[PDB]
Design a protein around this ligand. Structure first.
Ligand SMILES: COc1cc2ncnc(Nc3cc(Cl)c(F)cc3O)c2cc1O
Length: 295
């Protein structure tokens, strides 16, 4: 057939000598995320990285590595390599400011409308790129966006991502309150399903990290969404911004915005931010960031 194109991405196997852990960034059940330095040998660079490290979840994390190795975009996190020791480690560029959900909550009293709308533009760019690569994320949320610098965010966590071919996906543990109604009812996922999750993610930012449908049981979410109910208009949002959010939550997935159009609309708004958001008061020497180490 060759109806699809060969995925000629490179999977880099990294020696364990090549990097040094430094701090435990966080622990789950799966494993731990560390921060460290990667020094490719005889390369005279030190690269700050995150390392994420045996049942059969090895096959699960290898799926994640497959996806992360195949994307290349300023607003998407790339896999640097894997290390195949006793444990399987994913190595990625360190995003020092952490996930945008925590960032928005810790700095809510110093976040201006320029930043919020710019974040919105950047996530639509990454999401539009994933759609270009025919990739459905299936878990877009503020907790899965990382902050490289306050001016530069990137989408991560591709454990649920699925690669549509040549329009929908059918699955069989899922984030209810970020899912489109069709994803709940029929377990269908589309780039337009992601546009819904994009809308919840913008709502998270505009509320400075509130929990959507806070205090509502996830099982009631389906019937509530059918009855016509959506998330409330956040205090700082003009109707212009909230009208974009509402459009992402339309029952007809095709009459929802495209990521390419969300880019345009938020760019127009980031061009005069205070018209659209009302907010009170608007160590080593050979360190190389990963975005500058291209091989
Ligand atoms: C400073 O705090 C943090 C910084 C981080 N910088 C980059 N990546 C993170 N996580 C992560 C890593 C890999 Cl390899 C993956 F495959 C998926 C991932 O989500 C980070 C997590 C943090 O808590």
């Amino acid at each position: 057939t060759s109806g699809e194109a060969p995925n000629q991405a490179l999977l880099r196997i990294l020696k364990e000598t090549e990097f040094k852990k430094i701090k435990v960034l966080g622990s789950g059940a799966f494993g731990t995320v560390y921060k460290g330095l990667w020094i490719p040998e005889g390369e005279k660079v030190k690269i700050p990285v995150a390392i994420k490290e045996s049942p059969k979840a090895n096959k699960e994390i290898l799926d994640e590595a497959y996806v992360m190795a195949s994307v290349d975009n300023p607003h998407v996190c790339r896999l640097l390599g894997i290390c195949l020791t006793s444990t399987v480690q994913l190595i990625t560029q360190l995003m020092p400011f952490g996930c945008l959900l925590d960032y928005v909550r810790e700095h809510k009293d110093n976040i201006g409308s320029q930043y919020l709308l710019n974040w919105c533009v950047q996530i639509a760019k990454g999401m539009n790129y994933l759609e270009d690569r025919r990739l459905v994320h299936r878990d877009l949320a503020a907790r899965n966006v990382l902050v490289k610098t306050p001016q530069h965010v990137k989408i991560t966590d591709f454990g649920l991502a699925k690669l549509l071919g040549a329009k929908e996906y059918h699955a069989e543990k899922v984030p209810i309150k970020w899912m489109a109604l069709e994803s709940i009812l029929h377990r269908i996922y589309t780039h337009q399903s992601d546009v819904w999750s994009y809308g919840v993610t913008v709502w998270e930012l505009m509320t400075f990290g509130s929990k959507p449908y806070d205090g509502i049981p996830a099982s009631e979410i389906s019937s509530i969404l059918e009855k016509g109910e959506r998330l409330p208009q956040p205090p700082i949002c003009t109707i212009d911004v909230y009208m974009i959010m509402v459009k992402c939550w339309m029952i007809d997935a095709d009459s929802r915005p495209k990521f390419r159009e969300l880019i345009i609309e938020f760019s127009k708004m980031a061009r005069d931010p205070q018209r659209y958001l009302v907010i009170q008061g608007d160590d080593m020497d050979d360190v190389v960031d990963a975005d500058e180490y291209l091989i």
